[PDB]
Design a protein around this nucleic acid. Sequence first.
RNA 1: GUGCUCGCUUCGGCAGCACAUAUACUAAAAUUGGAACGAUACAGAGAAGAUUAGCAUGGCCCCUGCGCAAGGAUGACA
Length: 89
Amino acid sequence: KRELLRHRDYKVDLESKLGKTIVITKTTPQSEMGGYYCNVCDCVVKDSINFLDHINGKKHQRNLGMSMRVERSTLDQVKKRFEVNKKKM
RNA sequence: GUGCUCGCUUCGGCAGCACAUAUACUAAAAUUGGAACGAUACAGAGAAGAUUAGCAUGGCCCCUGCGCAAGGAUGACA
C-alpha cells in the first residue's frame, strides 16, 4: 500500500546556510554537520543539486510512503484551478 | 458458403452430394525489489635508499708485559 507521489508545497532551504560556518568536532551529529540532512533518510548530502536528487529519489519517497506515480488530473480540476487563480487575483 | 441431384417438392422450403480441416512465446495488462566509479565530499609526492654515527669483535704485521713447555751461549776469588 503506497500512496501516490505528491508535489511538495514548501520551498527548499538550499540557500539558508550560506556563509554560516559550522565547526565540526567528533561529537557533533550528522544533523548539524555541514551540508544537507534528510531527517527522514538520516543521510547527509553536500550539494544543493545532489540533495535535490535525493529528495527526488525512489528511496526518499519510499521512506515517506509514496511511489513514482503521479495523479492523473481531469478536466474539471484544471478548469477550477484556472477559476481559483482568477478569483485570487 | 458456392454449385448440383432428373429426390420430397415449391420457386417460400427441405434431404443428400463435391470443395473448406485444426492459428497463437500464446500476452494488452499485474506488481514489489536490488542497483555507478556519474557528480559532489575527503585525501592526494600518483615511481626512489626505506637510513648514518660511535665502539667492540673477526683477518694480517710488528712492539711490550705475564704465564707454560722445551731449550741455547756466557760469568764469577778467599
